[PDB]
Amino acid sequence: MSYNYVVTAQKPTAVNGCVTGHFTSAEDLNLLIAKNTRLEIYVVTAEGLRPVKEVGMYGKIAVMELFRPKGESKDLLFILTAKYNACILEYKQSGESIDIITRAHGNVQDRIGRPSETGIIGIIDPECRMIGLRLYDGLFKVIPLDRDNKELKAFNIRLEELHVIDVKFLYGCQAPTICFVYQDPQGRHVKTYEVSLREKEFNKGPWKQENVEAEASMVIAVPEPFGGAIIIGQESITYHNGDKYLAIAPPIIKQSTIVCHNRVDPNGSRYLLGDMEGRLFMLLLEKEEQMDGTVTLKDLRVELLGETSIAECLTYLDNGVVFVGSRLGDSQLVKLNVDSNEQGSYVVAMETFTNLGPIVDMCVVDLERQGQGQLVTCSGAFKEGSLRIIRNGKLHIRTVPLYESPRKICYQEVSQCFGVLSSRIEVQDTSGGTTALRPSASTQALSSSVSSSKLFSTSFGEEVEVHNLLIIDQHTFEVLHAHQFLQNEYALSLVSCKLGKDPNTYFIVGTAMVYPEEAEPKQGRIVVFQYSDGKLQTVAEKEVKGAVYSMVEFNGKLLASINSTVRLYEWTTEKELRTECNHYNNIMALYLKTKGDFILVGDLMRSVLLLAYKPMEGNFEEIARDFNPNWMSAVEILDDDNFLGAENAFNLFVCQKDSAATTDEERQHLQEVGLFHLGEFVNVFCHGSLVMQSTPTQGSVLFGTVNGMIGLVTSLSESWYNLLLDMQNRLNKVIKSVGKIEHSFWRSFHTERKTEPATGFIDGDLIESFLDISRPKMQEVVANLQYDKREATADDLIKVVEELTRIH
Amino acid sequence: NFDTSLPTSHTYLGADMEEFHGRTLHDDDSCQVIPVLPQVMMILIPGQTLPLQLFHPQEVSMVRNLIQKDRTFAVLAYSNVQEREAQFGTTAEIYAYREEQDFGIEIVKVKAIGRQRFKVLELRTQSDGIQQAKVQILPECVLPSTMSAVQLESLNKCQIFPSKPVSYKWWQKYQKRKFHCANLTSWPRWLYSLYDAETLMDRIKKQLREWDENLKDDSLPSNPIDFSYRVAACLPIDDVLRIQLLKIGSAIQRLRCELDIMNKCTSLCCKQCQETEITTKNEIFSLSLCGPMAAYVNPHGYVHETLTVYKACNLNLIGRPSTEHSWFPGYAWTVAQCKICASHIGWKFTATKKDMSPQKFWGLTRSALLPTI
Ligand SMILES: Cn1nc([C@H]2CCC(=O)NC2=O)c2ccc(NC3CCNCC3)cc21
Ligand SMILES: [Zn+2]
């Protein structure tokens, strides 16, 4: 009984995969980028990147590779999704038409098994003979590579090692050989196996087992003529080739942890390494020729190339040009110079690409005072933090760097400013204290202040988080004011409202007092600041026993959640908070939403409660509840009877209050009414719209995710819902998806333990794409359609779809 | 210096027993009807043992029929003893059986263990003096790690940790590295750790370690479900708390509730008095692998639960040492009664002559005890 509609306003931006090779032609250098569900294909040229193609897949891309079987002019792309749909695709271009041909496809799911903690792993034989996969612990799946395997049938092999840290293939071996590093009670080791397709089994590898560092994580398969493998851990780098064994411990690596790598020269004479803190190293392999025998290694070196964005994947294109794909910030295209600048870095920034994600909080405002709204979001983390202003013009985006992690944001019209909660990383000093790592917005405020309440009365090299409240102008986006909180304090909630008869507007902040020894908070604060004449004042404060997990302004009073308790304070004329109502529950009220006199309480375990406030008695009475063990990210209220939430496995669910029930038992239960598989990790919900203000849709809710995607959700009516469902069925029947994946399976509610078809949600992306097809396909889709009644020609469908698309 | 594996075997009821090997796991959420014992006022938790001596014709016939078909029956936790109603119960699988004759009366010795929970959906009275309840098997939900849903891979190579050394710094490092992706969400790291199975288990074990000082990591199970059931079995609370812990369907929620109960309870007192200091939390200490509380059966026929403690007040002792069917091999015992209510409370035990062991032992029954949180 939901009748909802969900569409995507901004496509995801975070890049999770990148590869390079000859894909579109035998002589063109191609770069392929995978951003969640989107695939982009560029042709590298002298000046930069020229976009060539862009497509979408009905799933999340977990593995991507390029390989050229014998007798192939170009390469083929092997792709695997998060639901274990696998496919092999080819690039076909005839004249002015570009499309990807599905050479093969299949599903490689297993009936039973617990997925490995380390996640999906996929590799390909350098000889292009088979594909190896690691999905569930204790098993290793193998897919033969033959022209007669259009169904992609694979078989499993047993691994006696349960916890396999990493695995890779090896070069220059007569039979397929795999080297992998695993762990057991004794420690971590590296072992090699030979894969026998004929017998479908394992055989003793070329060289025996060996012991490695206690933190080895990276395995690199050096090509010919060196052969062997390289193990990269926390404090050492080693090279194994059977009898030959070499090792080095570069001190300049102890600070960060290598997480990405890539190969520069074809013969494996150099490599690029990327750590967690936006650093880029160049690893070199020296070569020595002895007599008339295959060259051998002599030594290893690491040189600090420089600094870039926090890198998730690296790729060397040409002429010392490197693509750095990142998830916490903007992607980059940089250059390498033989010489060094004065500072000493060999990297020269060339080009940048925006990345909204991750989105941790947002608000909708109207800076121009028109009817057209604008969206302000807190994007990125660490030195990549910033504010993003999005306005409809394609979307127009403006970025304001901060150099620290923002967490919250709110708007206050009267003062014409934004209040932002933020945090920065500081390192303990020798004398005992804190020192910042770099200039940031928190430390560069025109005016500064430090909280001084005294209401409550370590080691070297440790890291701490310093929280701050930043008052930012709304025209120039410059940091007007900064206020620091007490040491060891945490900020959780932020609001701006007016209380009681007081005509002023305050910032009300909730904070918790956390200590490493204690496991749960036991003391927190609510602070009321007033920002006037460019200065911030601590108007009032109240100390509570617990941790304020949320706050919402409730018809002139303040509603707060303290541990497993809900409290309602009023605002007397003496500028103070006096507790007015209390209510005790059995869960922590992490999520708190309000609507008229109804309050929605939500817990991290997907427990939902619906309460009401009794004005005549001034007490809280429980109205409804619903409990179902699962992970929940956010909740929202659509109307007086419908509620929306984001659940584990990247799912959306919609519950309804059964007010039509006859007996109390039914009246006090919330019936689930809608399920959907969004494919994104929803992080924040908000009410508003980006288009300037009879319509076929009522209301609108925007949601922001972790990959930088932005989505919109609206309501509908029964007739429109049925019409759209029929249209979607017909379109799925007609159109074809890349990889030959069934759309319904893609939008099926997945939870790793149960699966159900999507209900109550009308996918909007398919309807929108309805317009990009040729006329004959539209006629085929519209054939035998009953629309208000008549034959329902394609013109009616086109008009209705245009009406829908107009909403964004 | 007293063996902790002796009382667990229940050697008192018998030495040689016809052990039955094999398991029959009922399909989840299915609907099945099973016989119910007539006289049972004990709430059974999965993974706990239960002996029983039976001498009634209809009950003995029921057991004889059952001992060959599946060896499974049902136990109903009664919310109210007077009115025999219940909404939740536990399936019990029998793993022992013996027969005896006492000059013309058949006596059956049975040992079983709980397997699964359920919500009763109907009950009927067969024309044999017993009852049969049709019920649906409840589900056992286990959730993946909270951080697995945040992203897909990110840094999966760092999600596996070195073996825990045989610790504060280790725990801090574990929290810092395991939940590193928490910065991509709207909640801090400690908030996520508050819903982590391993941290909850470690806190539970640390809380319990005061009671037993020789406790071994192998002494308590490793799986969250087994650990939760074991902890819930051996806590000194009234039947309402046990029913509440039974209703919970998720391991994490059960662990959180158990930790809350542990941190709330302070002391116990006579049920009839409602105000009589008999013992505090610290005094609790176990002498068996199962824990301070375990199941036993009087040769008279009634089965009484008892715990282990080393201090009692407001008690009057009555009787002299005896050893005829005592559950532990080698010990004296004398009845005790409330000083004010005069009601029987427990049994005072004196160690045996052999070598030496705790001379004064107090073993009470939860029926006459109630916490004072
Ligand atoms: C009432 N009551 N309680 C017990 C407890 C005491 C503590 C224990 O370790 N186990 C128990 O069984 C007990 C044991 C034996 C008899 N025996 C009588 C009936 C059979 N004929 C001989 C007299 C009665 C008994
Ligand atoms: Zn008493």
Side-chain angles (χ1 to χ4, degrees), chain A residues 560-747:
Chain A
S561 173
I562 301 155
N563 273 126
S564 57
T565 303
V566 176
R567 209 168 303 176
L568 212 179
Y569 300 92
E570 56 196 35
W571 183 252
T572 62
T573 177
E574 288 66 5
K575 306 296 190 70
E576 66 197 52
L577 288 172
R578 171 181 60 188
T579 171
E580 182 259 21
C581 183
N582 239 342
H583 185 267
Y584 311 94
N585 40 22
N586 222 283
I587 71 186
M588 308 191 312
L590 299 192
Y591 307 105
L592 214 66
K593 291 308 183 54
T594 187
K595 165 85 173 195
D597 284 336
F598 295 104
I599 308 183
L600 176 74
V601 183
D603 187 329
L604 186 59
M605 293 295 294
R606 190 242 183 271
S607 301
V608 177
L609 246 176
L610 178 61
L611 314 179
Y613 173 78
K614 315 317 299 298
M616 51 76 211
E617 211 283 338
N619 205 323
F620 280 115
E621 64 171 352
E622 168 177 339
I623 286 191
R625 58 164 54 198
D626 177 10
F627 289 160
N628 197 34
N630 193 9
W631 299 120
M632 155 180 287
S633 296
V635 295
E636 180 48 286
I637 292 188
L638 297 180
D639 63 6
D640 250 7
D641 296 320
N642 302 116
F643 319 111
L644 177 63
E647 265 183 337
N648 173 23
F650 323 109
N651 295 319
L652 285 169
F653 75 96
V654 177
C655 298
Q656 173 174 341
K657 173 178 56 176
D658 185 3
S659 60
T662 59
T663 178
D664 178 298
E665 186 283 336
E666 36 181 351
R667 270 191 313 280
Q668 298 195 11
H669 189 220
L670 293 176
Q671 259 79 46
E672 188 280 331
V673 295
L675 302 173
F676 192 75
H677 182 60
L678 177 63
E680 308 274 344
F681 185 84
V682 170
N683 230 333
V684 62
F685 278 107
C686 183
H687 268 86
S689 181
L690 293 180
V691 305
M692 210 296 296
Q693 73 85 20
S694 57
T695 175
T697 69
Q698 304 88 47
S700 70
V701 172
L702 297 167
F703 63 84
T705 75
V706 166
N707 282 274
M709 168 197 169
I710 300 188
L712 173 151
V713 179
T714 61
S715 301
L716 289 180
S717 60
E718 196 179 38
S719 62
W720 280 71
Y721 181 81
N722 305 323
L723 186 69
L724 297 183
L725 210 62
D726 305 11
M727 265 72 289
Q728 180 170 309
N729 283 333
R730 290 165 169 259
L731 267 183
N732 256 337
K733 207 184 316 305
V734 52
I735 105 173
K736 52 199 169 185
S737 60
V738 172
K740 304 213 191 72
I741 297 187
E742 318 80 11
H743 177 276
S744 180
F745 173 78
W746 158 234
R747 297 302 186 180

